Design a protein around this motif. Sequence first.
Motif, PDB file in Angstrom:
ATOM      1  N   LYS A   1       0.842  -1.181   0.000  1.00 51.36           N
ATOM      2  CA  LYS A   1       0.000   0.000   0.000  1.00 51.36           C
ATOM      3  C   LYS A   1       0.883   1.239   0.000  1.00 51.36           C
ATOM      4  O   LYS A   1       2.015   1.219   0.481  1.00 51.36           O
TER       5      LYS A   1
ATOM      6  N   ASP B   1     -10.057   4.433   7.878  1.00 51.26           N
ATOM      7  CA  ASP B   1      -8.805   3.761   7.565  1.00 51.26           C
ATOM      8  C   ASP B   1      -7.626   4.398   8.287  1.00 51.26           C
ATOM      9  O   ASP B   1      -6.480   3.987   8.073  1.00 51.26           O
ATOM     10  N   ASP B   2      -7.900   5.376   9.159  1.00 60.38           N
ATOM     11  CA  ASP B   2      -6.893   6.197   9.833  1.00 60.38           C
ATOM     12  C   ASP B   2      -6.262   7.191   8.865  1.00 60.38           C
ATOM     13  O   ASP B   2      -5.085   7.520   8.961  1.00 60.38           O
TER      14      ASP B   2
ATOM     15  N   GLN C   1      -1.961   6.085   6.268  1.00 59.80           N
ATOM     16  CA  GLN C   1      -1.318   5.417   7.385  1.00 59.80           C
ATOM     17  C   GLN C   1      -2.220   4.339   7.962  1.00 59.80           C
ATOM     18  O   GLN C   1      -3.438   4.493   8.028  1.00 59.80           O
ATOM     19  N   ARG C   2      -1.596   3.234   8.373  1.00 58.96           N
ATOM     20  CA  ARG C   2      -2.205   2.260   9.281  1.00 58.96           C
ATOM     21  C   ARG C   2      -1.929   2.798  10.672  1.00 58.96           C
ATOM     22  O   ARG C   2      -0.784   2.849  11.107  1.00 58.96           O
TER      23      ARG C   2
END
Length: 79
Positions: free
Chosen positions: A13, A50-51, A34-35
């Motif tokens: 990603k 998804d942050d 970002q995760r």
Amino acid sequence: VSSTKNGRDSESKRLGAKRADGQFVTGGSILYRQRGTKIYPGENVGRGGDDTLFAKIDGVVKFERKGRDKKQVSVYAVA
RNA sequence: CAUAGCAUAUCAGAAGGCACACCCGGAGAACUGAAACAUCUUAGUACCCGGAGGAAGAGAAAGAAAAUUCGAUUCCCUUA
RNA sequence: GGAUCCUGAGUACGACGGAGCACGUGAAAUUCCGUCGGAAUCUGGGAGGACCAUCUCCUAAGGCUAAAUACUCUCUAGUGACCGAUAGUGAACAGUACCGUGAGGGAAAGGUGAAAAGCACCCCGGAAGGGGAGUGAAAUAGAACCUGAAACCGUGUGCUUACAAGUAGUCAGAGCCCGUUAAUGGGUGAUGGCGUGCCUUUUGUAGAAUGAACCGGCGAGUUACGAUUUGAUGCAAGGUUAAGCAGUAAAUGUGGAGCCGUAGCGAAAGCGAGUCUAGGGCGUUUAGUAUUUGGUCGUAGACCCGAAACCAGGUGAUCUACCCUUGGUCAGGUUGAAGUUCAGGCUGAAUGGAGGACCGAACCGACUUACGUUGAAAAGUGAGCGGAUGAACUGAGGGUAGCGGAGAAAUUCCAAUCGAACCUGGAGAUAGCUGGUUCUCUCCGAAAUAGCUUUAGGGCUAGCCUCAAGUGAUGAUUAUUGGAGGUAGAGCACUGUUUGGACGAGGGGCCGGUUACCGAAUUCAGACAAACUCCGAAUGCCAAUUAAUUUAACUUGGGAGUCAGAACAUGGGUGAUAAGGUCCGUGUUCGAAAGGGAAACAGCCCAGACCACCAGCUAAGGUCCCAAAAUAUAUGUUAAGUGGAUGUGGCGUUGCCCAGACAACGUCGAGUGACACUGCGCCGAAAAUGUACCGGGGCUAAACAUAUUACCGAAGCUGUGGAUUGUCCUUUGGACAAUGGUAGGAGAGCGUUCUAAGGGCGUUGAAGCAUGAUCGUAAGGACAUGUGGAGCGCUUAGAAGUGAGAAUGCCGGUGUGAGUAGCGAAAGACGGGUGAGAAUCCCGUCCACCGAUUGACUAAGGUUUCCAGAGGAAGGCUCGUCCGCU
RNA sequence: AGUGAAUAGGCCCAAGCGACUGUUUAUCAAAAACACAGGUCUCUGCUAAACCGUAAGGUGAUGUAUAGGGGCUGACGCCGCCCGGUGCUGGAAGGUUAAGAGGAGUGGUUAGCUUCUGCGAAGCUACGAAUCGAAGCCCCAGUAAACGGCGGCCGUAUAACGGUCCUAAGGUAGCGAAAUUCCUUGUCGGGUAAGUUCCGACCCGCACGAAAGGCGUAACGAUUUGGGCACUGUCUCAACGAGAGACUCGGUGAAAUCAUAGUACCUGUGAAGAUGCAGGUUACCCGCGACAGGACGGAAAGACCCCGUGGAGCUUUACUGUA
RNA sequence: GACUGGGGCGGUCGCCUCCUAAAAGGUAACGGAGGCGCUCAAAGGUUCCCUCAGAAUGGUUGGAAAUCAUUCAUAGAGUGUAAAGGCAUAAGGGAGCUUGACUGCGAGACCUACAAGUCGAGCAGGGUCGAAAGACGGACUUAGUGAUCCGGUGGUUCCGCAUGGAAGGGCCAUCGCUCAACGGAUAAAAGCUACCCCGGGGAUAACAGGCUUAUCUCCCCCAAGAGUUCACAUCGACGGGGAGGUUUGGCACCUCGAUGUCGGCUCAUCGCAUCCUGGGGCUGUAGUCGGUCCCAAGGGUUGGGCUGUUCGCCCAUUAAAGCGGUACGCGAGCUGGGUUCAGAACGUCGUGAGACAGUUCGGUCCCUAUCCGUCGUGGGCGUAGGAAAUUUGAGAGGAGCUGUCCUUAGUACGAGAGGACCGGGAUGGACAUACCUCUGGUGUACCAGUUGUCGUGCCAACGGCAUAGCUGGGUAGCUAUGUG
RNA sequence: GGUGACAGCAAGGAGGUCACACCUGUUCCCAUCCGAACACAGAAGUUAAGCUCCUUAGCGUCGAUGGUAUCGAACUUAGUUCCGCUAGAGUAGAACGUUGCCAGGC
């Protein structure tokens, strides 16, 4: 002849910074992928499920410092 | 009995060849294309048989259609 | 008038099975064939794409029917920006020569002159052939007859060559011989420098990778219909006709069926500058249309050549297999299995002599081995060898035919061809594969990578190239500024590894305990990590800018190619801290790059070729000779030429000190002996043709070093002149420039054949052919002369069978090998004769050979070859007076 | 020197495989391969079965079970345990459950006789006890000169017997290192020779069990394989003769091949094996005769290997069809 | 079916997380590690509250500890699912009420060849929790599916054939089987070729060359000890270490429009890492014996039995019966036994076609030499007068090997039996070389003799043909096995 | 005291009903085995603790200066030179909060 057990991986990603400090952005623009919460929202900034950090008005982006180590991103209005 | 048929005396009506180019019938592939292959396509084509004419075939509404209509069939251009 | 009888029977219709209709059978509505079942008679019955109704529409189950339309083996008259003898029909003189058992396949080959006036006559010759002479405008126009190129073969001559090492040229250059499109002239060349053909395919070819013997001809992106996009031209809110018609197989005229546009949106009813579901998509804020030119695409064989195979119709059992009917052949020997006379007490004196018998000729076969292998021969010969009255060998006839037949069985045979014969057709089958694809110059110039793919040497879209149109800072490199981020390094604070060193409660020592001892825990003590980090760079990334120089960048369209990469240095994985290994990343160069250096040597170092010059400065590398430039300076090392040992080199301290320290069992005098970080050495180190790394000679510097200077050195740069093209002050000139190139994109031209119009030339000599020292930037153009004997240029336009060096291309001609291999089993000698000519023909007299046949017949088969006289062009593997040849 | 020339069987001892005469891959295989006379198993009652044909018509056969067609096997002479498609003819009888008739009895609707509710008959309708009984249910109560196998383990190298899983048993004689055994030239051994591969002597049966026959032969044989005796240029080790080619002269006169050639070697370099590149070394020009080291010599677009969504042939319980 | 350090066998094929990955993003290999093809009506929403595993402390049975209180106790707790990134704003642990696990949409952005994928402010509508601000379009984040076509269920204000219902289409919502080779040939599909064909490739294997050197052959470097004991005479234990040369392998750079063959035969040419001979030395050599080394490359280095054999075992010798390179030298010089060909028998394993790599019998080896090279033999020219004959030798090539009998010496030495070295001529030998034919022998095709068949000239004697008919001898030349 | 901008942990020292806490409670709204928590009702006494005033740098937090390397460039194939940017340790040194807008009280 032989048998290789490994050989797996996933698609990468394209996480990280998407807009540059000092750059005029548009309303609803994605500033960081970002995760998790490596960088927090700020003034006129949101977070998605998804942050993902994003702008809420048309302004200028600044990356800044939140507490002692936590970091945040803001958007300030007048261009 | 009578038919069939035997003959006789009669008309020679036919039979073969082919421009198989066109036309009308009987029978009827495969390689190929689908990036393999079987429904499908090539194609009712090639090739085989007949009839054979100078043309053949079709043709005179138990229809086409929905208008106020055309008005047997056949051929050209559109619709496409 | 309108219903009093009529109004087209196994019919209409139904089912199961199929087919034809654009339609894969569903609604097949509509129409047909096979099997079966099987209504009504006009207020009836059949249709309008399932079907039920109102509405129309029609009246089946019988027959005939012109016109407008298709094709051309033929006939007569003509036409062509159609071919001119490798073309156009296979065929200008042929379905012939020839090839095949047959079905069948299938050529090469035009030219005297105006008129035969087609060479009387003499000479040489057996003749052929020639030399004169003659005819003719002309016999190098003589039948091998228009012209007459090249390959290839000769004769003569000017210059050059027998110490010489080679892609045969190029640049320099004497000597000798000449004299032209007379001009900075031509031929040849002692001697010096440099120099591994072309095409194809490749990361990379002198390649020992492919192709070509040579020369000539022929040999490969075309046309029709559609679509898209450029250029041109007419008309413009419009623009344009199709088929048909009168005209010449033309233009033109006519002919509005149609098609595009002026309005879009939605699946659709529909609404309309809006619409579909405020906020959104596609729209409105206008130019299109017809013909034609260039590019690309689609359907057609679609740039050309090339399969193994599949299917259809035919031909063959004169070879061979098996069978049917009717006929033939099989020398000689040997052997006593129910023969048999007598004599004896059933074998002796005796002796039919049979059989898939058993030795051997004819005949049939084919086990060994020699020879032969561009053979005498596309299966043979010599010597041995198997059978030889039998399931034997063989002749003439007939029969079985390709999914077939035949097979004492081998995929063996079916006309020298068979795990499926031969011929013709479908057919130009298909070939994501190999090969080939033909004039010139100017500008620009890649890629060898994502992703997906029954995909992996193929393709598609993206990336990178090129052309045109638009837009306008949006492009690039540095400063000064912010920003995101966990690599190098380092560090153990967390997760794991770690070695030594640590502390007592306790299971434990025991006779419950001591205590050391086993284990875990915490503990002071210290090294390590791609998947540990909190402490973190240099660079690279994004951006913003009244922060400087630079010339790009982007959007939309036409056209592509590429998807095998390579070495090198640096960062890493894999492998073995291997590979000219393999896989990624960041650069460079090769690919597609000539020039100089590294001896030679795509990828290493320097450097990017528009053209001329016998000008100059430099790069990398160099300066004793080869081979240009310092035998240059000044100052040092080296003596070796191309694991540790006393090997030596300083700075060092030092224990013992000349009171006498190490030795000789007191002599002895100058340092003793130790302990190291560093310089050159040391052995260390042991393959095959031939010295063998300065490349060679050679060098003690001509080695290696340092510091200065000088010079040489490239197609780099500067001088001088030129070309073509940008660029922009535009004086288009003064400059600012630019100009290596493969796939590939863009531009401008040269030649060939044919047509129109205009002007020309030509028997006082066209085209073609040959030679020349001429002109143009290239493809190419002239002119002069000789040969040739009737046609051919130029200018502007148009149309194409428009350009060859390569395809183991097709056809013809001619080389090389080379005076080479061979001249096909086999007795000849001498005399005489005829002849231009005799080993070879004729006649002897001898002598040899076959000798159950190389004899005499008889067949099949072949068809005049048979006899006589004449003849020697070809034929006969030599000759020839001879002959199966004329 | 008397078959005085020419012609005319070499023998002996041991082993395989096949009974024998015969046949076979025209053109690399002639044999152990194919046949064969005999054995067997099965089908056929005659317009036979079987085969060719779309069919008519044929062959079989002008035959008739001592005959004909198909399979296996191969003269002669000696020679069982087993049928298992989750199990195949016999002994049997208790049985169970498909189709059918059997009806003690038992209900919505009025449910009489009893409206002070009950043997409820009986109609249309809506159910139900007895006891009996098919193939199969059975070890489906046959089969092998039909496809086939002949078990695993464990005491131990169902090998011998010894306890076993489960089944149909999982081995008759005979042979027994095996054209078959890797270990394993099994161990034992020996005959022959100087020295081995010269012949059968235990079971220690991976790869054993009897017409897809196991053992013996007298005959055969251009079959395979050993060992002797003749005899010899096969060899030690070559020599000498005779002819045909060759080689010289007269005559006649091809072919494959071929980018152009003024075409040396050694060390190197290079697509990593050079006549043609670098540095050296050697070499006057031109023939004839001989040889075969290199021109990665000629010849045949490698037959091995891989590839192509190329093909052909064969097999089968691959897919889809069809006689 | 494809991929593949040739192919086959084997493994794998889609998605998620982390290293490799070189501080943005991206980035390969048959490189190194693990997960997924779900689960939960609460483990979702919203208002409140609330906050440690372990240790230490003690505590009625204490499986030591679970249950009990106190000191802590950095979060090491914990979070349904692997990893990473984040969380005490808790995003972790309890309680109430609930279902936003809603209907239309969306400015703009990330990712990306495409088709797909991701995040969103806020605007309408209708709501749950909270007193209220307000918060809510599932889940701490990122895996948990897969187009289209066909088929099947329900709505409709869409079309529906003349008109009208209408079965059927269209639109909106909702399904099911298969595509796991997971961008899915349409959702139906195995093998043997050893008769194999055609198109290609040194893009890719088997031999030979090239690189490398794990492996292999060797050369150096360092030691407890055995050895009676003495480390080092002899060996080096656990051992590890540097090198040099390339022989089973790694790699795929030349050759697939062909570089065509293992053993043996014939003929060589180089090396040294020495088998014999030649020099030397060391000895734990009494002495011969011997052990052991070093230096030394000229020449020599074998006859048979068995196996196709390389290799290998055996019999006899010899002075000795080395080890290597050269396309594992040499097939346009030879053979053809082995093996890769069509026939056949056996064994094993397959339903079968067939296979194995086990056996066994049988099975067609082409070429006239152009250039360079080699071995022989000629023509031309040359070289300061022309010739004939004798020569010099710069420089080439060829030849250098071995064993017996004799002293010495029986001296040294040997308590026993056993046995040193060393000196002369010579000797006559074995191999291989190069002459030659007097001698022994071979052969002699126009030499003399004997003899058998037949045909001619008729007895005989000749001549012809029978391999020169055969048999017996043999001149010169040429020869070995003969002589130098 | 309240809110509001960029230094801690503890250890001895003291100081007061103006702060706010320590306490009195189950009596009420609240409210859980427990008024231990949470509520509310007291306000008696009170700096003993929290609060609060230097403070000790002992623990902790910052952080120098010296300078110990990795872009660029050559040299070379074994890491050496010239550059520019400089870490992590580690020394010195600081450091027991600067203090924004109100009440009350100054």
